[PDB]
Each structure stands twice: as C-alpha cells, then as structure tokens.
C-alpha cells in the first residue's frame, strides 16, 4: 500500500573507456523513471517512464547541475577512501549509495534511508531515527564522528521533507495509472517427462506487479523446501514480472503435489495442481 521514491547511485574511480564515472537510476516502487550519468565529465539524463514527459524544462536543468556536482563529489570521496584504506593508485574502486523516502496510503511520510557501500560491502547506514549513524570499522567510525559533530543529517531530513516528498507526490499523481496498481499472477502447472521415467512439475506465475511474490510446492504431508528449484524473480520487459518453481516427482504421483502462490493482487493464496 505504501510507496517509495528510490535512487541507486554508483561511482567508479577508473572506469573502462566509454564507461560512466557516475551513474544513477531512479525508481518509484518497481518502475524506473530516469537514468543520469557522467562520462568524461559530460552529464547526461534520459527519461524512462511516460509521466516524465510532463516535467518542465526547469526540472532537467536543475537535475543537470546536481549530476555534475554529485559526480565531482563522489570522485573526490573515492580519492580519500583509497588513502584511508591504504590502497594502490592503479586499481578501480566502487562507491555505491541508496537514497529513498517512503509514504503511506494517505501520502504521509513513514521513513527514509541513506546507506553507502565501498567496493561492494556496507560502509555506513543512517538509522531509523534519521539522526544517528551505524559504522562497520574504524574508517567509517571517523565518518560517523564527523557527520554527528557537523549535524549533517539535518540536511538529509530537509531533502526528505522537501524535494523527495515533492517528487514522490508529483510522480504518484502523474503516473497514477501505472503506479497505483496491483496485477495478480496468472499461474499454471506444466508437466515434463524425463528420460529416466520420472516427471518435472513446473509451477509458473506470469504477468504480475509488483515483483514481490512467493511460490511453494507441498507434498500431501511432507515439506518440499530442499526439494524444489526456484528461479529468481525476473522482468518480462513490459512492466510485469515472472517466476517459476519446480520439483521432480515419480510418474503416477503428480496429484500428491500442490503449488501455492502468494501475491498482493490475490484475495487469498492460490492453490494449483497439474491438471490431467
């Protein structure tokens, strides 16, 4: 029921030729709305959702300046992190961070997040209170100490209560048809004989939004957790998601098995068997 505005930021210190030194993608819930990057110091921006056509030119001009300033700052931060971690100058290193704000059904603010990683591992996290920080080691402890002495989380809260809230409100209004929706899964069980005489049962779920889903197989009175093969949920490319879960079973016992599907768009767990 709640909704989130989320940005996923990456900076790279020695990118390959043609590769971005900085890139960020923005989402509302599970729908991407833009790409920003900087390649050889040139900032670029592209829309990815149809409601972005309603943004005024002033939106993109302000965004362009933010992209230039962020990329310069992340580059400087990568230089400092190399020194504090006693690392060599030749290699390429990675700085990632996530920024988000969350509202409830009635558009009331519920929370926000700021979290950063260096070379793929947690570095620092802003806590639930939006005032204190959680570090992982003595380098990030220095960062925490400086952020809390400076009171720097004040300025993140002002971003959350200002531009983050403004954009989430406007995007939920202009993109209402795409964003304020739940598409239920269309589900079926497929049957595949195997060369050795047993059978693969594959339970499919297609065409659902949002992405979060659960698929489970169950045998009469026996738990099949370790038995099933479950693929990571995956985009179909049209704005919906798909997934399957499979078990191998003896020929003739297919009706002992049941697939259960749980999704926001269903009124209750759906139960499926191989029909035949």
């Amino acid at each position: 029921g709640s909704h989130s505005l989320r940005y996923f930021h990456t900076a790279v210190s020695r990118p390959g030729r043609g590769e971005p030194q900085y890139i960020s993608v923005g989402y509302v819930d599970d729908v991407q709305f833009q790409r920003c990057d900087s390649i050889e110091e040139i900032p670029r921006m592209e829309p990815r959702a149809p409601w972005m056509e309603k943004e005024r030119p002033e939106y993109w001009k302000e965004l362009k300046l933010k992209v230039k300033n962020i990329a310069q700052s992340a580059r400087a931060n990568l230089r400092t992190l190399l020194r504090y971690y006693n690392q060599s100058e030749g290699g390429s290193h990675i700085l990632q961070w996530m920024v988000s704000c969350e509202v409830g059904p009635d558009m009331r603010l519920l929370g926000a997040h700021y979290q950063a990683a260096y070379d793929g591992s947690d570095y620092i996290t802003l806590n639930e209170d939006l005032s204190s920080w959680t570090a992982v080691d003595m380098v990030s402890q220095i960062t925490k100490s400086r952020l809390e002495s400076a009171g720097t989380a004040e300025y993140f809260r002002a971003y959350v209560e200002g531009e983050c809230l403004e954009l989430l409100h406007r995007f939920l209004r202009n993109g209402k048809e795409i964003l304020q929706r739940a598409d239920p899964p269309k589900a079926h069980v497929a049957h595949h004989p195997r060369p050795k005489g047993d059978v693969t049962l594959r339970c499919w779920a297609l065409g659902f939004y949002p992405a979060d889903i659960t698929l489970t197989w169950q045998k009469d009175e026996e738990d099949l957790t370790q038995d099933m093969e479950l693929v990571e949920t995956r985009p179909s490319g049209d704005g919906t998601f798909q997934k399957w879960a499979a078990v191998v079973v003896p020929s003739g016992e297919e009706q002992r098995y049941t697939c259960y599907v749980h999704h926001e768009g269903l009124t209750e767990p759906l139960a499926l068997k191989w029909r035949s």
């Binding site: 930021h9 992209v67 960062t143």
Partner: peptide, 7 residues
C-alpha cells in the same frame, strides 16, 4: 539526488 561526503 543527494550525496553526503563520507570523509
């Protein structure tokens, strides 16, 4: 579109 200097 927000960034905090880590150091």
């Amino acid at each position: 579109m927000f960034f905090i200097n880590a150091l």
